[PDB]
Assembly symmetry: D2
Homo-oligomer: 279 residues x 4
């Protein structure tokens, strides 16, 4: 009878390398641990979604204002109606009678450059401009001469004297709670220049969240500059938008299943057919 | 120094249970093997996609007519235009500039009961009717009194003197090549009864493919009745539709990328907003 | 627009920025005294006041100060002290203007002789900058244009130090020729790099010590603010003497500078009872002339205009500013608000009138108590909706509002408001039917209007061949050719567009003022483009002169900036000219006529379109050359074209105040070059009746001399033989009389009226009119993105945050459309917190980690993990809730439920743990259970599940309530025991999968954390080891 | 009563732009049309999966050898065992009892740069080298000096005297049937240089398929150079790999459901836990 692998490991007789590494959650043991913190201690220390997210995404005990800011970001990105690409896809999959997971996933797969990536894009653009040391006017001119529109700038209806009211809540929280907001100040200077061009070139929710998240990361004491830069590069802000919008997509799925909408077919009048004469 | 796991396994001193089982493909070894059959021999037997699918899905060497019929089924399910739910979702995800895999997956997640499940549904319905021993008229009456529509029956415009033209090719192939078609004959009797009701209640491409696939499975010598029943139960026909329509979904993605279509946002005039007064 | 700056500001800029080898004296050595200044403070911040003698003169843009006794010389500190108060803060009358003395300047006295009184002036012209120098300057300068040395410096030409001693310094003293020339060169550099348009130093004194600038009058191109921002700093533009500045004027000026639209407001008489809301500079000018033609000049309160398609918000801000200004004092006779305008070309009348009516609703109180009567005349895009909403506000507020449309002559609401009428080389042919244009910028509405015009004109091909937009990649844009759908290419670069479309001969530049110069300069590098239309307003005059010089060199016709463009009925239309297709059909601009016109204004050009269509055969060609000081092409440039064009039979010129341009037409008629009948009216006659120097909306609308007044121009044209109406009222009649007398002689043979091709109505317009019915394909009840504020299930987002709900409250709103209690929202949050992650070994976390190590993506990795959420993994929440709800609703006791599940071969969902049984519980079940038992009002299903747990643990210890079981039963309890849901609603939510949603949303946090962890650790591609896979392939299939 | 939108469109009284464009399939009409070509004629010309794929992906009537080569590419990319990332994910999702679509989709979402993207990577890399005009030795040295491995080069065990036997089949077909193989000849020259280094750097199946697909696109008469370049840029080879491996992923799902494997949990001994001491 051959030696039992588990019982050989128990005596430490053999060496089998572990193929996986994790640092965010320990399920083994008498107590569940979130990045070194017991779940009961998680609940006595009175964090919520923001604190749990800080533990699970950054392995940090964020300050209460940081945790609350993360919560508000999730609340403001929760939904933006059924007409966007992801909500449209989720509704189509729900009306196909498919599944909650399948419908939400179908909607989420649209999250990318054109839809839902402006948070990360604005964060990266403003961070690069701030770190290069160029002044906001030079940054605006450089984007204009490079044929690029500033990510996180520009609104559809709302302008100066017609505040977004989602940007205002987050901005007011950031000014009254964050210790320092250098990148937010830089982005506000850029916004002043762009609104001097045409009124609706205001800081978006995407731009506000991106710059405020970068400011939180590199101005709260939990992260070094390298850590904050790495998290921005690997996509913590993409994760923020995805987690926020999943709430709205699940709401849309539940809405369609309660309304008991049937299978959707796109009308032919809305499709232009440009097939070749004969291939 | 503790003993090496791999080298202790080579000496056969320890026992570690394998957590996975597979029977369709052997990647290791001098030659790639598809269900016991070398890849060079796969190409020497001049089989194609249908034969490779037979190997990889059923671990069987199907006859040439069976493999050719599988190929024709994939050919006829390849696409049905951009208005269906899956193609719509794929096009939305492509116009969001996302990715080929993400776009195709977004479209594929709609494949289920209401869209793309009629193949399996019709196969199961007709198999159950044929196995229960009831005549086609009794089957029609039982479905009528149970408040269920016969899946795989009923077209939109093409009824008679103008058939599906996709049902016709497949039915002609099955007639000329399949040895016996008991469930197909049963489905055709059901179709005669339903067309005696109103002309457009004809055997759909979904119904024809489902009944002909059950016929191929349980009338070619490769499978026993239990095996054919198990394959129908676990979803070989869902697999057939998914694989066939993947070709069309990828074509739709490539078409949108070539046409360079921008981000789609659903018009507000097409959405009815029925939010509550204040919640 | 050239704005005069104060002497202090000009001297400060000169001292700060001039670069001369000459030792400029008294640098930053001047004193400003005002009534609100402290003399001790000035004495201790400017000590030279005691060091030398003084000179004092006001700095309120008063000229001729020497001979009106406003300047005091050779008087000390005590002298200026005794000298100011008898004049400081007093009343002075210069010309027709009178005003206070709130600003004075004190400078050192310069001891100088009459032999060193020099005059140096630099002023801008179309062909360049003229530099005048006089050796006998000062008071005795006399005539300057005939006795002072003149020297033109052309556009893009440097004023070299030589040729100044040759042309400008013939009579200069030899001992001071060199330093004088150096100073003049430095002064020209100062003039050119700070975008001065006028710079007169009189007198200039140069002693052995150095050069003294005793005085200077300077006008600066205010539109160049975006260029000279750091050099000007906070440059201020004083109002003309006799006018006091107002915060409302400053607010409107800031609003105007903040956008590409035009917003002008000038307060002439705050006590006046006539107020105007006129769209368009030319329309505002003609309304002003009409008001002062009926004797309302004394009661005219403001001159104002809004142009450039202002937004709803901008129009609201403008309207509310004027409404607040109108509701300050009270007039016994009441007050009048003239909301006028021409027929707009592209200004959204609906949006602008929505802004105005919002302001009217906001001020309906003071407006009603002020007896304000509103007269409205307007036409343009969507004017029916705007007239409708203003009429509605007129009754929903009580304000007497009389709205009229195009059928009114637009100089009629003035008559019925003031109580006078009852209230009811360069080519000749720029465009043809084969003209192809390239549009710079995304102007899809403008391009579509162009295509609609081409279709109703029976053109073979669309007039727009390509579009250029540098902020996107090359693609094809979808447009309408009648009812057919066509694709128009869009290019990132000019070069690609001109490469692929060599047949294009016209550019329509929709670039802003900051991009128009560069785009036009780049455009004139292609010889195929023969006409460029520049739409942007606010381009600096120096840049426009550069464009003019290059276009003249290249033989390219430029339809000057700040123009709507032009229209040639039957052949071609520039941009938004002529408005939308309904106006094109109303003015019959799809077919040629015989009257060609040139105008400065665009809206006035649409008015001309309407008038000519009504009174004559029609329009052959109409060009608006723009309101800028230097148009790309002038009046004569187009009148010559029309005279040389055989299809036109009479010419209509709509001139303006300022610029001796109509005198060229007079000379052309005198020399016999112009022979066809010409009908001209020059607008701006009210400036002669205004006791001030008000600047109109147009940049060029400024009478610099006495011959550039509109009255003088109209008189000169009348003596030249041009048919000149008595006013803009009689323009239609004189055009009609000329057309009739030209028809009766057989000169004009009107053609048959062939009906135009029909264009289908737009779907959006038909929906707005409620003409058609299209069922909505989608239904939503959870979020309303449209509107001013985002709404989550009927409750605004600001209210969401003010009520202090968090994720739990937002989730209640978005998932159930209920305002859940605080404990319910908090419990939802804790459920999400406890389902957040359970390590990397579960199926979903494993799949997510695999996809992350495949280097894939956050969304793809999370989605790969989420697709495992189902029956075997992640579905125990819903399964336990459904099982326990069914058992509890069946009425069977927990023991019966346990026996039943045992006899059906089913394990109880949500029962059974791995290690933690009793005396050591889950520590997650405990937290949630303690919260539920402390905050939930009633927990019947939780009590039932606890009884079931008591039996299962009577069987074996680890059969305890799981986190899944406890969350399921507690969620059902919350749904059906908080007051928000009925039993049917709670059952439906449980059936459709709210608990599946809870688990999915909770575990998404852990899956994203796992993805980020793998990316931080930089784990490579995973491959499952072969020793862990059992291969059971058949022997040979 | 307002006019019906469909009635107003039929009368041509209103204009509503179509928000979607398609050029690959016409579902409306008496017959289904694949890129301008009727389905009955599709089956009459005796093309199969390869011809249908040519129609749906490129809107071209490819030559018979091109269609057959596309079929062989799909056949050789069908499966490579259960150990790869996508098959592993599919097997996990199937053992979670989930669904065919969900399981296949879970496996497919791994298709990207590290897994399954070598086809497109090799095609793009060799195309750039061939178009730049540098000789194979210069290309090899250039990739060496930029510290990049040549995509499509390098095998695990099979180098010479025992080649891949999939590369051999595809290469023999390409040599016998393709009119010209310039990029293939270039890649074989590169492979000779790399095998002069040590034998195991041979032309991979990924490299062979990439270069042979580029050769087919730009050497069959159906495409111009711009068209072939655009198709390679937008991801026809990614589509080829995805469609080929979907058959293997569905086979793996069906295999797991036939073997009735339970829920998988990764062993704790294979995971290294590196959580922080206390966050
Ligand atoms: C997530 C965020 O907060 S923003 C995300 C993007 N972030 C960026 O900053 C991207 C960079 N910035 C930009 O490119 C631009 O400034 C934009 C796109 C953000 C600004 O958008 P705009 O082009 O001004 O307007 P948008 O394209 O959203 O709206 C199109 C028009 O159709 C209308 N419209 C919008 N959605 C719909 C709909 N579903 N149905 C019908 N009409 C609609 C709107 O009224 C709008 O009209 P208007 O803009 O002329 O008033
Ligand atoms: C898609 C394709 O065709 S390959 C991708 C193409 N990309 C490129 O070609 C880019 C450049 N090429 C490369 O990166 C490299 O040449 C590779 C990765 C393709 C070749 O890698 P190699 O290190 O030569 O082989 P690989 O990493 O696949 O396998 C290494 C060894 O592990 C063994 N092995 C492979 N998979 C497993 C498994 N699941 N369990 C246990 N052992 C395994 C192999 O037998 C091989 O054995 P050896 O030690 O006797 O050589
Ligand atoms: C979401 C939830 O709350 S769980 C789902 C709830 N659903 C139900 O309640 C359904 C009914 N209940 C049941 O089916 C059962 O009671 C279960 C599955 C919940 C409990 O099953 P058990 O057999 O007690 O434990 P489980 O199957 O989890 O694993 C048992 C052993 O595997 C070991 N194990 C678990 N995970 C791993 C891993 N990743 N690696 C190695 N070993 C492991 C444990 O150490 C345990 O050993 P022990 O029993 O000697 O301590
Ligand atoms: O094929 C049909 O007729 C039904 C259909 O649109 C699809 O599900 O593909
Ligand atoms: O939470 C548990 O105990 C069971 C588990 O692993 C999961 O589904 O996440």
């Amino acid at each position: 009878v051959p030696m039992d692998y588990s019982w050989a490991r128990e005596l430490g007789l053999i060496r089998k390398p572990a193929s996986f590494m994790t640092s965010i959650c320990d399920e083994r043991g008498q107590e569940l641990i979130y990045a070194g913190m017991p779940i009961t201690e998680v609940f006595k220390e009175e964090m919520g979604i923001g604190g749990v997210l800080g533990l699970l995404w950054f392995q940090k005990r964020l300050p209460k204002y940081s945790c609350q800011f993360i919560e508000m970001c999730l609340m403001v990105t929760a939904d933006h109606g059924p007409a966007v690409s992801g909500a449209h896809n989720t509704i189509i999959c729900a009306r196909a009678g498919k599944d909650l997971v399948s419908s939400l996933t179908s909607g989420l797969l649209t999250i990318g450059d054109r839809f839902g990536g402006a948070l990360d894009a604005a964060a990266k653009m403003f961070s690069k401009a701030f770190d290069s040391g160029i002044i906001p006017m030079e940054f605006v001119n450089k984007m204009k001469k490079e044929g690029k529109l500033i990510m996180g700038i520009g609104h559809r209806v709302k302008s100066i004297n017609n505040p977004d009211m989602r940007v205002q809540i987050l901005k007011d929280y950031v000014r009254q709670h964050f210790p320092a907001t250098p990148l937010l100040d830089y982005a506000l200077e850029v916004e002043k220049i762009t609104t001097s061009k045409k009124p609706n070139l205001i800081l978006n929710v995407a731009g506000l969240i991106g710059v405020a998240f970068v400011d939180m990361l590199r101005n709260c004491g939990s992260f070094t500059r390298e850590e904050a830069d790495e998290y921005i590069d690997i996509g913590a802000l993409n994760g923020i938008f995805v987690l926020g919008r999943s709430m709205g997509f699940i709401g849309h799925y539940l809405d369609q299943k309660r309304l008991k909408q049937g299978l959707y077919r796109h009308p032919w009048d809305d499709i232009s057919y440009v097939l070749p004469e004969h291939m």
